[PDB]
């Protein structure tokens, strides 16, 4: 029900380190990475470009496991 996920606040380029300005949280479906994990995602890189408004999924972040 109201589980929030990490959503791209701007287009995030391929192989670019995540910063706090790039991640907002929102209740979306399907559920992606939990919003609580935003501080731990800081400095991790995406392995594909992530368009504005896309839910960040576990498979998109290099080195993510949680």
Short mmCIF file of N, CA and C in Angstrom, two decimals, residues 2 6 15-18 24-27 30-31 34 38 40-45 47 51 55 61 63-66:
data_model
loop_
_atom_site.label_atom_id
_atom_site.label_comp_id
_atom_site.label_asym_id
_atom_site.label_seq_id
_atom_site.Cartn_x
_atom_site.Cartn_y
_atom_site.Cartn_z
N UNK A 2 1.13 2.08 1.03
CA UNK A 2 1.81 3.35 0.77
C UNK A 2 3.33 3.24 0.85
N UNK A 6 12.34 5.17 -4.56
CA UNK A 6 13.24 6.19 -5.09
C UNK A 6 12.84 6.39 -6.56
N UNK A 15 26.47 5.69 -15.87
CA UNK A 15 27.76 5.71 -15.18
C UNK A 15 28.06 6.99 -14.45
N UNK A 16 27.04 7.53 -13.81
CA UNK A 16 27.21 8.76 -13.07
C UNK A 16 26.80 8.44 -11.65
N UNK A 17 27.60 8.95 -10.74
CA UNK A 17 27.40 8.80 -9.31
C UNK A 17 26.15 9.56 -8.84
N UNK A 18 25.30 8.87 -8.09
CA UNK A 18 24.06 9.41 -7.59
C UNK A 18 24.31 10.49 -6.54
N UNK A 24 14.13 11.61 -5.51
CA UNK A 24 13.02 12.02 -4.65
C UNK A 24 12.30 10.74 -4.24
N UNK A 25 11.28 10.78 -3.36
CA UNK A 25 10.55 9.56 -3.13
C UNK A 25 9.11 9.78 -3.46
N UNK A 26 8.48 8.69 -3.85
CA UNK A 26 7.11 8.76 -4.29
C UNK A 26 6.48 7.39 -4.17
N UNK A 27 5.16 7.30 -3.95
CA UNK A 27 4.46 6.03 -3.92
C UNK A 27 4.09 5.72 -5.38
N UNK A 30 5.19 -0.50 -10.25
CA UNK A 30 5.69 -1.39 -9.20
C UNK A 30 6.64 -0.69 -8.24
N UNK A 31 6.86 -1.33 -7.09
CA UNK A 31 7.74 -0.79 -6.05
C UNK A 31 9.20 -1.05 -6.45
N UNK A 34 13.49 1.00 -1.85
CA UNK A 34 12.82 1.76 -0.78
C UNK A 34 13.38 3.16 -0.61
N UNK A 38 17.72 6.03 0.22
CA UNK A 38 18.36 7.15 -0.48
C UNK A 38 19.76 7.51 0.08
N UNK A 40 22.10 5.77 1.44
CA UNK A 40 23.06 4.75 1.11
C UNK A 40 23.31 4.70 -0.40
N UNK A 41 22.37 5.16 -1.23
CA UNK A 41 22.61 5.22 -2.67
C UNK A 41 23.54 6.34 -3.09
N UNK A 42 23.75 7.38 -2.26
CA UNK A 42 24.66 8.46 -2.58
C UNK A 42 26.05 7.91 -2.95
N UNK A 43 26.59 8.34 -4.11
CA UNK A 43 27.87 7.97 -4.72
C UNK A 43 27.87 6.64 -5.47
N UNK A 44 26.78 5.87 -5.44
CA UNK A 44 26.74 4.64 -6.22
C UNK A 44 26.40 5.03 -7.65
N UNK A 45 26.83 4.28 -8.64
CA UNK A 45 26.57 4.60 -10.03
C UNK A 45 25.47 3.79 -10.65
N UNK A 47 23.91 1.94 -14.00
CA UNK A 47 24.48 1.21 -15.12
C UNK A 47 23.76 1.45 -16.43
N UNK A 51 15.74 8.05 -17.12
CA UNK A 51 14.92 9.22 -17.42
C UNK A 51 14.21 9.79 -16.21
N UNK A 55 11.23 5.02 -11.74
CA UNK A 55 11.53 4.39 -10.46
C UNK A 55 12.89 3.69 -10.53
N UNK A 61 21.47 -0.12 -10.22
CA UNK A 61 22.52 0.54 -9.48
C UNK A 61 23.62 -0.49 -9.26
N UNK A 63 26.42 -2.29 -7.71
CA UNK A 63 26.89 -2.56 -6.37
C UNK A 63 25.78 -2.54 -5.36
N UNK A 64 24.53 -2.35 -5.78
CA UNK A 64 23.45 -2.32 -4.82
C UNK A 64 23.04 -3.74 -4.43
N UNK A 65 22.84 -3.91 -3.14
CA UNK A 65 22.26 -5.11 -2.56
C UNK A 65 21.72 -4.58 -1.23
N UNK A 66 20.47 -4.87 -0.89
CA UNK A 66 19.89 -4.45 0.38
C UNK A 66 18.64 -5.26 0.61
#
